[PDB]
Amino acid sequence: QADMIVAPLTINNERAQYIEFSKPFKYQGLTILVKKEIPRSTLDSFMQ
Amino acid sequence: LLNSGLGEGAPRSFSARILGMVWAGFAMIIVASYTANLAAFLVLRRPEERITGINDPRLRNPSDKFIYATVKQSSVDIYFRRQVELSTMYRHMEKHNYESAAEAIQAVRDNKLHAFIWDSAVLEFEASQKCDLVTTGELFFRSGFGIGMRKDSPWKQEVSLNILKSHENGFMEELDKTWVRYQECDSRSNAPATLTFENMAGVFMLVAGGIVAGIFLIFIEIA
Amino acid sequence: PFQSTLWLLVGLSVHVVAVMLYLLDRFSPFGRFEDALTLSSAMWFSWRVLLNSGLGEGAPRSFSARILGMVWAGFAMIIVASYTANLAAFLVLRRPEERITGINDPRLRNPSDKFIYATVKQSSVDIYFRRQVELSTMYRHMEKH
Amino acid sequence: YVRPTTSDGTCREEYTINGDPIKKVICNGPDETIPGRPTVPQCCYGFCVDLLIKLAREMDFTYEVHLVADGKFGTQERVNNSNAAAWNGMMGELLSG
Amino acid sequence: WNGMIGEVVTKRAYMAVGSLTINEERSEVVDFSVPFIETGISVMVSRSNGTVSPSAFLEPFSADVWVMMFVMLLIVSAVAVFVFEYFSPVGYNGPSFTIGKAIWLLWGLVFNNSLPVQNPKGTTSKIMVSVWAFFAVIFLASYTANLAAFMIQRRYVDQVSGLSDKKFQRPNDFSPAFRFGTVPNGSTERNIRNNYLEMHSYMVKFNQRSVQDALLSLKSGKLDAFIYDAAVLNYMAGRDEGCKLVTIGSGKVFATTGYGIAIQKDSGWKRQVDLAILQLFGDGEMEELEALWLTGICHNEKNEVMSSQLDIDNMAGVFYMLAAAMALSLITFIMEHLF
Amino acid sequence: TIGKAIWLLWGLVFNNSLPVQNPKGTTSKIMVSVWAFFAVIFLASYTA
Ligand SMILES: N[C@@H](CCC(=O)O)C(=O)O
């Protein structure tokens, strides 16, 4: 029941060794950054 | 000390002259040191707890208190399978992983997991949509997302030409232009003057406390 | 960092406020003697609020000179606080450029005829560069001269 | 540190900047000013000299220090010689007899 | 068609490499395959269109310090005038004389009290003057520290959200001269020519030859903008001597493509050759060759730009506000003269 | 005039502090303005 996939799947030799693939439309890498937290005070009465 | 005045006289004796000079100098020293500590407090970029770049040293070090979970049963397992360099970490990162994307994205923001290993494709969309995450600059381990068809399908050349012509006219610029919203927060220390009114209000409440204290003082005066 | 035309504009504003203090209250056309009265007093007020001086004799009774003195004192605080900010920005230069890399510099692997990385000829560095196999493409360039 | 002998006697006696006498030894070395290589008797002193004195007082033996000229590359016979065989030149850099 | 691609037609080159971006012409005259590296069309200079940096003086206010300062002036003036200034039952002009002098006294204390004016008699009023002076020096310290700390931050020319701006249609839009061009006989000339006829007709009069000539033109001041390939701009801007000019953004370019290869007739390996590329990502050669050959010199998180002062504006804007207050004082003088 | 002059200059260096008084000569007022300029420049360079 599948003919063509429109999902941005990865391209590897194990997957492309048994099927034909086309050129990618967007080259993006992997990242490991989650989030950042900035320490600050809202009230700020100095004397800290 | 507080630099005020009225205009009615001046100390004639030299003792109060030298004492007033060294006292005014001490006032300049304490106000210049207070301003210097204020600028040193606003210049605190916290240049700490940052990342490395293309490869973090903590990824190769096996730890039990900071598990680097990832999406179970996906393309990251195939990428970790076809490699040979980082093979000693596949056994550690192979266990204790989630097989759902929403569970991982919700877990890394709902205080559950320590970190996640996933491409920036969904990270830039969830970060540019929920306004809760932020992406880095470098993009290590680059990959391409293409479309694969059958070998007996002659339409792959026509669809390929439709993709090429779709990238030559400017339709991809319209899709990426209308599907990538530039929201703010580009760094962890880019706009330090985004509050101010709360920092000034925290002293304003003490000013009001000094006004009530002044009402108590005039209550003592009229007594 | 700023051209002299900026200070010329600051002084031009001093002339605008100086002639403005004379345009507000009614006086008499001078141009007969050398030293005036309301012009010298208005100039002493401009240099008193701008340069932050101190000399007690009265206060501007008109509200026009009151608001003009308030916005003028605010402009003085803006130019002195901005000048101090430019001084701190000039002292915080730290020069975080023209630095090195660390364990290996990228320029050592790329050939450059204008920045020759010379070394001691016929020493232990030639033996270290001879027994290696990693950085072998640079031994021919660094071998001469 | 190689220093020529002053006048026509032995080494120059001096002290350091912390209050400790400095020891100097006799060492024969050439000169870079004259095109030739004459035997110039000078005085050597430094870290390796003090280490050689320490090893000379911790062990009962006699030594004789000498300055080595050029030839510090292990003898790399790369010049196209007139069809002849080579052998170990400087190298390990020890047995110059 | 002529050039190197003709070598594929004359059966004298089974495979060729180099700067060959995948498009419709190369996929039309001959065959293609998968590119190993990505690139695109980019501009050498940053995306700024020659704009002036905004004012950094009214930014910390954000229409809040003036409003809150006015409210604090109203409540401090009122509560401060209805405690000791109103001791005897007087008329309406009584407390007004103390308000007009009180606001000028507080204004004198805020701005380092440039005028001592005078002083009352009550000691509680002197204590309140001392507290207001403490808030004045604290507000001054936070104003100089906040303004300086904001000045140390990034205030250079920021990127805009507009790729195709006025320079891609009408040439007579900016009065000063702004030269721009590219190297003729290439994929960029045919792409821009088929996408922007005005930019091509106005671009043929400004042509380049090589890369060193373009670097000398951008360094001296002859050329303003330089649109070319993304890889040539990453290596050219990367191997800079002073690290002055930078590309648009930090890697966000349009028209994503890549350098691939071209073959004559699909009969040999072909597919396996593509798998060979898929082997590279399996060995990490892209990182070693990328950090070995594709590396530059000016690679040091190019995200902040600082130099000297350009404000030949901010103080001009504050002077414009001074002119607005001058016109307000003029209209106020007319209203005073009418009565 | 020296005893009052040194206290006036000391008052101008440490930011007003005490207005004390003022003479009558206009050139003395100009010199007070220049000394105040050096006072605020020295204060800006001292805080920076
Ligand atoms: N690849 C292009 C040159 C680089 C560019 O596109 O600017 C060509 O062969 O014409």
UniProtKB/Swiss-Prot annotation, chain A:
Lineage: superkingdom: Eukaryota
Binding site for glycine: P8, T10, R15
Location in the cell: Cell membrane; Postsynaptic cell membrane; Postsynaptic density membrane; Synaptic cell membrane
Complexes and interactors: Heterotetramer; the NMDAR subunits are modular and harbor tiered domains that function in concert to regulate opening and closing of the cation-selective ion channel pore. Forms heterotetrameric channels composed of two GluN1/zeta subunits (GRIN1), and two identical GluN2/epsilon subunits (GRIN2A, GRIN2B, GRIN2C or GRIN2D) or GluN3 subunits (GRIN3A or GRIN3B) (in vitro). Does not form functional channels by itself.
Function: Component of N-methyl-D-aspartate (NMDA) receptors (NMDARs) that function as heterotetrameric, ligand-gated cation channels with high calcium permeability and voltage-dependent block by Mg(2+). NMDARs participate in synaptic plasticity. Channel activation requires binding of the neurotransmitter L-glutamate to the GluN2 subunit, glycine binding to the GluN1 subunit, plus membrane depolarization to eliminate channel inhibition by Mg(2+). NMDARs mediate simultaneously the potasium efflux and the influx of calcium and sodium.
Family: Belongs to the glutamate-gated ion channel (TC 1.A.10.1) family. NR1/GRIN1 subfamily.
Protein name, entry field: Glutamate receptor ionotropic, NMDA 1
Shown segment, full-protein numbering: 507 to 554 of 903
UniProtKB/Swiss-Prot annotation, chain C:
Free-text note on domains in this protein's UniProt record: A hydrophobic region that gives rise to the prediction of a transmembrane span does not cross the membrane, but is part of a discontinuously helical region that dips into the membrane and is probably part of the pore and of the selectivity filter. The extracellular N-terminal domain (NTD) is a site of allosteric regulation to modulate overall receptor function.
UniProt-annotated stretches for the region Pore-forming: 39-58
Binding site residues for glycine: S124
Function statement: Component of N-methyl-D-aspartate (NMDA) receptors (NMDARs) that function as heterotetrameric, ligand-gated cation channels with high calcium permeability and voltage-dependent block by Mg(2+). NMDARs participate in synaptic plasticity. Channel activation requires binding of the neurotransmitter L-glutamate to the GluN2 subunit, glycine binding to the GluN1 subunit, plus membrane depolarization to eliminate channel inhibition by Mg(2+). NMDARs mediate simultaneously the potasium efflux and the influx of calcium and sodium.
Compartment(s): Cell membrane; Postsynaptic cell membrane; Postsynaptic density membrane; Synaptic cell membrane
Cytoplasmic-side segments: 25-38, 61-66
Intramembrane segments: 39-60
Superkingdom, taxonomy of origin: Eukaryota
Entire-sequence positions represented here: 555 to 707 of 903
Record-given protein name: Glutamate receptor ionotropic, NMDA 1
Chain's gene name: grin1
Regions that span the bilayer: 4-24, 67-83
Family: Belongs to the glutamate-gated ion channel (TC 1.A.10.1) family. NR1/GRIN1 subfamily.
Curated annotation (Swiss-Prot), chain D:
Subcellular location field: Cell membrane; Postsynaptic cell membrane; Postsynaptic density membrane; Synaptic cell membrane
Disulfide bridge partners, by residue number: C11-C43, C27-C44
Residues linked to a glycan: D31, D60, N80
Superkingdom classification of source: Eukaryota
Function field: Component of N-methyl-D-aspartate (NMDA) receptors (NMDARs) that function as heterotetrameric, ligand-gated cation channels with high calcium permeability and voltage-dependent block by Mg(2+). NMDARs participate in synaptic plasticity. Channel activation requires binding of the neurotransmitter L-glutamate to the GluN2 subunit, glycine binding to the GluN1 subunit, plus membrane depolarization to eliminate channel inhibition by Mg(2+). NMDARs mediate simultaneously the potasium efflux and the influx of calcium and sodium.
Subunit structure: Heterotetramer; the NMDAR subunits are modular and harbor tiered domains that function in concert to regulate opening and closing of the cation-selective ion channel pore. Forms heterotetrameric channels composed of two GluN1/zeta subunits (GRIN1), and two identical GluN2/epsilon subunits (GRIN2A, GRIN2B, GRIN2C or GRIN2D) or GluN3 subunits (GRIN3A or GRIN3B) (in vitro). Does not form functional channels by itself.
Family label: Belongs to the glutamate-gated ion channel (TC 1.A.10.1) family. NR1/GRIN1 subfamily.
Descriptive protein name: Glutamate receptor ionotropic, NMDA 1
Gene it is expressed from: grin1
Full-protein residues shown: 410 to 506 of 903
Curated annotation (Swiss-Prot), chain F:
Species: Xenopus laevis
Cytoplasmic membrane side: 24-30
Subcellular location: Cell membrane; Postsynaptic cell membrane
Function: Component of N-methyl-D-aspartate (NMDA) receptors (NMDARs) that function as heterotetrameric, ligand-gated cation channels with high calcium permeability and voltage-dependent block by Mg(2+). Channel activation requires binding of the neurotransmitter L-glutamate to the GluN2 subunit, glycine binding to the GluN1 subunit, plus membrane depolarization to eliminate channel inhibition by Mg(2+). NMDARs mediate simultaneously the potasium efflux and the influx of calcium and sodium.
Gene name of the record: grin2b
UniProt-annotated stretches for the region Pore-forming: 4-23
Ranges annotated as spanning the membrane: 31-46
Family indicated by similarity: Belongs to the glutamate-gated ion channel (TC 1.A.10.1) family. NR2B/GRIN2B subfamily.
Intramembrane segments: 4-23
Protein name in UniProt: Glutamate receptor ionotropic, NMDA 2B
Comment field on protein domains: A hydrophobic region that gives rise to the prediction of a transmembrane span does not cross the membrane, but is part of a discontinuously helical region that dips into the membrane and is probably part of the pore and of the selectivity filter.
Tissue expression profile of the protein: Detected in oocytes.
